[PDB]
Amino acid sequence: AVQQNKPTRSKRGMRRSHDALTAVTSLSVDKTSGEKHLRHHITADGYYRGRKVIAK
Amino acid sequence: ARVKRGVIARARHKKILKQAKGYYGARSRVYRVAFQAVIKAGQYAYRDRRQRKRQFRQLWIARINAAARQNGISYSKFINGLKKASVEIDRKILADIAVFDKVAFTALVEKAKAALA
Amino acid sequence: MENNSRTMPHIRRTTHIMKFAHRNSFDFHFFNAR
Amino acid sequence: MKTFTAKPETVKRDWYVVDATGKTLGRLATELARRLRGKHKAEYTPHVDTGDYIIVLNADKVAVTGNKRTDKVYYHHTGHIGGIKQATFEEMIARRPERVIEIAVKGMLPKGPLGRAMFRKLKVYAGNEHNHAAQQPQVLDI
Amino acid sequence: METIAKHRHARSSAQKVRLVADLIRGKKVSQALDILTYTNKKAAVLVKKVLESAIANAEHNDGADIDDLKVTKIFVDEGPSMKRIMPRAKGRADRILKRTSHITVVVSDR
Amino acid sequence: VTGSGKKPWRQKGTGRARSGSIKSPIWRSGGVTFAARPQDHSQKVNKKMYRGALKSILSELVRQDRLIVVEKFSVEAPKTKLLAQKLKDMALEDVLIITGELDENLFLAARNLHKVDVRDATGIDPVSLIAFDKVVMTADAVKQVEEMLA
RNA sequence: CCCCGGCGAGGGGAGUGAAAAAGAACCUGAAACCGUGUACGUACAAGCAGUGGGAGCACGCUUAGGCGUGUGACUGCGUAC
RNA sequence: ACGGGGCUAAACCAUGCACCGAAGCUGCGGCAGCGACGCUUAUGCGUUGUUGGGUAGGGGAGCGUUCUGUAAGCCUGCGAAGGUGUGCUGUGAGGCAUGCUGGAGGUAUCAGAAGUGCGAAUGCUGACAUAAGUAACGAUAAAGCGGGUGAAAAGCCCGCU
Ligand SMILES: NCCC[C@H](N)C(=O)O
Ligand SMILES: [K+]
Ligand SMILES: [K+]
Ligand SMILES: [K+]
Ligand SMILES: [K+]
Ligand SMILES: [K+]
Ligand SMILES: [K+]
Ligand SMILES: [K+]
Ligand SMILES: [K+]
Numbered sequence: 001a002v003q004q005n006k007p008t009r010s011k012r013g014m015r016r017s018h019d020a021l022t023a024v025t026s027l028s029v030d031k032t033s034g035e036k037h038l039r040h041h042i043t044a045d046g047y048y049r050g051r052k053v054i055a056k
Numbered sequence: 057a058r059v060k061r062g063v064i065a066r067a068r069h070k071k072i073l074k075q076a077k078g079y080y081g082a083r084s085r086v087y088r089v090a091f092q093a094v095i096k097a098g099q100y101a102y103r104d105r106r107q108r109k110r111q112f113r114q115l116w117i118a119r120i121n122a123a124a125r126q127n128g129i130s131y132s133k134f135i136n137g138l139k140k141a142s143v144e145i146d147r148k149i150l151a152d153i154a155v156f157d158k159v160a161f162t163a164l165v166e167k168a169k170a171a172l173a
Numbered sequence: 174m175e176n177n178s179r180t181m182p183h184i185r186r187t188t189h190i191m192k193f194a195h196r197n198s199f200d201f202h203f204f205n206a207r
Numbered sequence: 208m209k210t211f212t213a214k215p216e217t218v219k220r221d222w223y224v225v226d227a228t229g230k231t232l233g234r235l236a237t238e239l240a241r242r243l244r245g246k247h248k249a250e251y252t253p254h255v256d257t258g259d260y261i262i263v264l265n266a267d268k269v270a271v272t273g274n275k276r277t278d279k280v281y282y283h284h285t286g287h288i289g290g291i292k293q294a295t296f297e298e299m300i301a302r303r304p305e306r307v308i309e310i311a312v313k314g315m316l317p318k319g320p321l322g323r324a325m326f327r328k329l330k331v332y333a334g335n336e337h338n339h340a341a342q343q344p345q346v347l348d349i
Numbered sequence: 350m351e352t353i354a355k356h357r358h359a360r361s362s363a364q365k366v367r368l369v370a371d372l373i374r375g376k377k378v379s380q381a382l383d384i385l386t387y388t389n390k391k392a393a394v395l396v397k398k399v400l401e402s403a404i405a406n407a408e409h410n411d412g413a414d415i416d417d418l419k420v421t422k423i424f425v426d427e428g429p430s431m432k433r434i435m436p437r438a439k440g441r442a443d444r445i446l447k448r449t450s451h452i453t454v455v456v457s458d459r
Numbered sequence: 460v461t462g463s464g465k466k467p468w469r470q471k472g473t474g475r476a477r478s479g480s481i482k483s484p485i486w487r488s489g490g491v492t493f494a495a496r497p498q499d500h501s502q503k504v505n506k507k508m509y510r511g512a513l514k515s516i517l518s519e520l521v522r523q524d525r526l527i528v529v530e531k532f533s534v535e536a537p538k539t540k541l542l543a544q545k546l547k548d549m550a551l552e553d554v555l556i557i558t559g560e561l562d563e564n565l566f567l568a569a570r571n572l573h574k575v576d577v578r579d580a581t582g583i584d585p586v587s588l589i590a591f592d593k594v595v596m597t598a599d600a601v602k603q604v605e606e607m608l609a
Numbered sequence: 610c611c612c613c614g615g616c617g618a619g620g621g622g623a624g625u626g627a628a629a630a631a632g633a634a635c636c637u638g639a640a641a642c643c644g645u646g647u648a649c650g651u652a653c654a655a656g657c658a659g660u661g662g663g664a665g666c667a668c669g670c671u672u673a674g675g676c677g678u679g680u681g682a683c684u685g686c687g688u689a690c
Numbered sequence: 691a692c693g694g695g696g697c698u699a700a701a702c703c704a705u706g707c708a709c710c711g712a713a714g715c716u717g718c719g720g721c722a723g724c725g726a727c728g729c730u731u732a733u734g735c736g737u738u739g740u741u742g743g744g745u746a747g748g749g750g751a752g753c754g755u756u757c758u759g760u761a762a763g764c765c766u767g768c769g770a771a772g773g774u775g776u777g778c779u780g781u782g783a784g785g786c787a788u789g790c791u792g793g794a795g796g797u798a799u800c801a802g803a804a805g806u807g808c809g810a811a812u813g814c815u816g817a818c819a820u821a822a823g824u825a826a827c828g829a830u831a832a833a834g835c836g837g838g839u840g841a842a843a844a845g846c847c848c849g850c851u
C-alpha cells in the first residue's frame with residue numbers, strides 16, 4: 001500500500017506537532033557541593049544528598 | 057545560428073508565477089500548476105463581470121422590497137406605480153435612497169400610490 | 174540486455190523485478206480472464 | 208458610488224416575543240425566517256446578520272391542518288447501520304415540543320456558518336413563560 | 350553587539366538538530382548550557398560546542414560579559430548530502446543520503 | 460554520432476519509455492534532428508538586372524552629389540602620408556577611388572587607410588558604391604564605365 | 610599572530626586585496642526544495658481551493674477624506690490540464 | 691417517487707392585471723472586418739449600412755530570440771550582459787524607465803539568414819522532494835564485572851568468570 005497523492009508540507013508539519021522535545025525543569029542543588037544534578041541521581045563529582053558516596 | 061532558450065523561457069515562466077501570488081501550495085510555486093490556475097482565474101473573472109451586474113440588481117430589489125413594505129406596498133405594485141407616474145429612477149438609486157434618506161423614499165411611495173388609485 | 178546502465182551497472186536483465194509475470198511468486202491463477 | 212453594506216459591528220438588533228398558540232406551523236415559520244435573516248429591513252446585506260431576536264412562546268400549541276398530526280413523520284439516522292429512526296408529529300409534541308418549531312425554521316434558513324448564527328437568535332419555549340424580561344421584548348402580533 | 354558561531358557540514362540531518370535548537374531559543378546562555386547538558390541527544394553535543402564557541406567569541410573578540418548573553422537567533426540549515434549505494438534483494442540498488450547540516454548560534458546582550 | 464546500434468533496454472517489461480538508439484535526438488549526446496551540411500548560398504542575378512542596378516546606383520550618386528569627377532588622381536611616391544594630405548585638401552575622408560588603370564604608387568599608399576578603397580573601373584561592385592560616402596572617378600574611368608554599361 | 614575545540618572538523622577576530630557574501634566545497638549565483646523573523650488569518654468547520662462582493666486589523670501616506678500595500682471573517686457562483 | 695423546509699393552498703381548472711428573470715433586445719463608451727458615398731485621396735481620412743461563438747482546416751497581419759551588414763558608428767567602470775524588485779505603457783505576443791545585485795561587455799535603424807519560442811511524448815540528463823525520521827541494522831552460539839588508555843569506552847587492550 002502506497003499513497004495516491006503527494007502529502008503536502010502542511011500535512012507534514014501537522015504530524016510533527018507532537019515531535020517536540022521536553023526540556024528538563026528539575027535541576028537540584030546538592031546541599032554541600034552546590035553542584036547541579038538530576039533529581040535522585042548523584043552529582044558529577046560523586047556526591048548525593050550531602051555525602052561523598054563514590055570515591056571516584 | 058544556434059539559439060539558446062534560457063533567458064526567454066525564464067521571463068515567460070516568471071510572468072505567470074507573478075500572477076499566481078496568494079494561491080495555495082504548488083499553485084503559487086510550481087509552473088505547471090500555477091499556469092493552470094491563472095487560466096481558470098481568468099475564466100472566472102470573465103464570467104463574473106456578467107454575474108456582478110446580476111447580483112447587484114438582486115441586492116437593490118431586495119432592499120426596495122423591504123423599505124416599500126414599511127410603507128404599506130409590495131415591490132411589484134411600487135414599480136408599477138412609478139411607471140404609471142412617469143418616474144424614471146432606476147433600482148440602484150431607489151435602494152440608495154431607501155437606506156440614506158427615508159422620508160424621500162416615503163414621498164416616492166405616496167407618488168406611486170396616487171398613480172394606482 | 175541493458176548494457177550501459179549508469180544507475181545499476183551491476184545488472185543487465187532486470188525484468189524479474191517489476192514485471193508481474195516474471196517474478197518468482199507469479200501464479201498463473203492470476204491470469205484467469207481466459 | 209458603491210452600494211451600501213451594513214457593518215456587523217454597528218447593526219441594531221431588537222427583541223420580539225411571539226405567541227404560537229393556534230398558529231399554522233409553516234406559515235408562522237416563514238415569517239420567523241424573514242426576521243431572523245433581516246429581510247424586513249432596508250439595510251439587508253446577504254453576508255451580514257441584520258436580523259432580530261425572537262422569543263416564541265407556547266410551542267406545544269402550534270397547529271397543523273389535514274391529518275398531519277398523525278401522518279407527518281420526522282426521520283433521522285444515527286450513523287450506525289440499520290439506524291433509521293422515525294417519530295410522528297404527535298410524539299414530537301409530547302416528548303420535546305420545542306424541536307417542532309426549531310426544525311421547521313432551520314430548514315428555511317440558509318445553510319452555512321451565517322445561517323447557523325441566524326438560528327442562534329431564536330428562543331423557543333414550550334410554555335407561556337420566558338426569563339428574558341431584562342431584554343424587554345416587544346410583542347409582535349404575527 | 351551580536352556574535353555568531355557556526356558549525357558547517359555537521360554530520361547529522363537538519364530535522365534532528367532542529368529538535369534540540371528549539372529548546373534553547375530565546376534563553377539566557379547560562380540556562381541554555383544546562384538544558385543541553387541533560388538532553389540525551391547526539392545533536393545536543395553538537396549544539397553545545399557551537400554555543401560554547403559563540404560565548405568565547407563574544408568575550409574575546411567583542412569584550413562582552415557572559416552573564417548578559419542570550420541566544421537571540423538559532424537555526425539549522427541543510428548541507429550537502431553524500432550519495433552512497435545500498436544493495437537490496439534480487440539485484441536492486443538503492444541510494445542512501447547521508448545528510449549534513451549548518452548550525453548557526455547567535456548570542457547578544459541586547 | 461559515435462556509438463553502437465544496440466537497443467539500450469528491451470521493448471516491453473521494465474516499466475519505462477521505449478528506446479531504440481542511444482544516438483536518438485531526444486537523448487542527451489544524441490544526434491541533431493536536421494543536422495546541417497556545407498551549402499552554397501550564392502544566388503543568380505540576370506545580366507540585365509545587374510547592369511540595370513548599377514545604372515540606378517550611379518544616377519543616385521550624381522543626384523545626391525556623392526560623385527566626384529577629376530582629370531587625374533595620382534600620388535608621386537608610394538607614401539601613405541602623401542595621400543592623407545591630398546585627401547585633406549579636398550575634404551574627403553571616406554572615399555572610393557576609381558581610376559582608368561591602377562597606379563602602383565596609389566595602390567600602396569592607400570593600403571593602410573581603412574576608409575579609402577582604390578579600385579579600377581573593372582572591379583567595381585554595387586555594394587561599395589553605396590557603402591562609401593564619396594566616389595571619386597577619373598575622367599578616363601568615367602568613359603570606361605559607359606562602354607561597360609552599353 | 611590571537612581565541613573556542615580533541616595538539617580535530619568547523620568557526621570568530623586580525624591581516625592581504627578594488628572586492629573575502631572573490632577563501633581554495635572559490636566569477637555571475639536563477640528555480641524546484643528546506644529554514645529563521647515579522648504582519649494578518651485560522652481550533653462548530655465540509656468538496657478543483659479560485660472568482661465576484663466584503664467587514665476587521667497592521668503598516669505607509671495625506672489630510673478639514675479616503676487613497677496605497679499585506680492579510681481575508683462572512684457570502685453568490687464554481688467538478689484540474 | 692415535491693430538490694428541501696413546509697403547504698388544505700403554497701394543489702388543480704378558468705379568466706385578468708402586475709412583477710422577477712439571459713452574455714436575447716435597448717442605452718452609453720471603445721476596437722476591428724466587409725460594402726456604399728464623400729471634406730479629397732496618393733492611399734489615408736470623413737459619413738453611412740452591416741458584420742465580428744467556433745474544432746479539423748484555408749486566408750491575412752505581427753511579437754520576440756541568436757547570427758551577418760549598416761558598425762573603426764553608437765552606449766558603457768560616472769557601471770555592459772545576466773540576476774532580483776518596483777513603476778508606466780500597448781488589443782496581444784511584448785516594450786520603456788528605474789532601485790539593488792553584478793563587474794565587461796552590449797547594440798539603434800533598415801535589411802538578411804535560421805539549430806527561432808515547450809507542460810505533456812510510461813521523452814532525455816542533472817538537481818531536489820514524498821512516503822518518514824517510518825521499515826531495517828544480515829542466522830536466537832550470550833554475555834557479566836574490575837582495571838587501563840582516551841575529549842569520550844556495551845564494542846579496543848589486560849584480567850577473572
Ligand atoms: N556472464 C555474467 C555477467 C553478469 C552480469 N553482471 C549480468 O548481470 O548479466
Ligand atoms: K561503438
Ligand atoms: K565576487
Ligand atoms: K534560492
Ligand atoms: K468565496
Ligand atoms: K542590472
Ligand atoms: K516530461
Ligand atoms: K523524511
Ligand atoms: K542478528
Ligand SMILES: [Mg+2]
Pocket residue numbers: 182183
Ligand atoms: Mg559487477
Ligand SMILES: [Mg+2]
Pocket residue numbers: 436437438
Ligand atoms: Mg536485503
Ligand SMILES: [Mg+2]
Pocket residue numbers: 440
Ligand atoms: Mg547477487
Ligand SMILES: [Mg+2]
Pocket residue numbers: 474
Ligand atoms: Mg508503471
Ligand SMILES: [Mg+2]
Pocket residue numbers: 488489490
Ligand atoms: Mg553532440
Ligand SMILES: [Mg+2]
Pocket residue numbers: none
Ligand atoms: Mg556571368
Ligand SMILES: [Mg+2]
Pocket residue numbers: 570571572573
Ligand atoms: Mg587597413
Ligand SMILES: [Mg+2]
Pocket residue numbers: 627
Ligand atoms: Mg574600488
Ligand SMILES: [Mg+2]
Pocket residue numbers: none
Ligand atoms: Mg579583511
Ligand SMILES: [Mg+2]
Pocket residue numbers: none
Ligand atoms: Mg573577472
Ligand SMILES: [Mg+2]
Pocket residue numbers: 638
Ligand atoms: Mg560564487
Ligand SMILES: [Mg+2]
Pocket residue numbers: none
Ligand atoms: Mg542563494
Ligand SMILES: [Mg+2]
Pocket residue numbers: none
Ligand atoms: Mg471559530
Ligand SMILES: [Mg+2]
Pocket residue numbers: 653
Ligand atoms: Mg453544533
Ligand SMILES: [Mg+2]
Pocket residue numbers: 693
Ligand atoms: Mg423545487
Ligand SMILES: [Mg+2]
Pocket residue numbers: none
Ligand atoms: Mg419587468
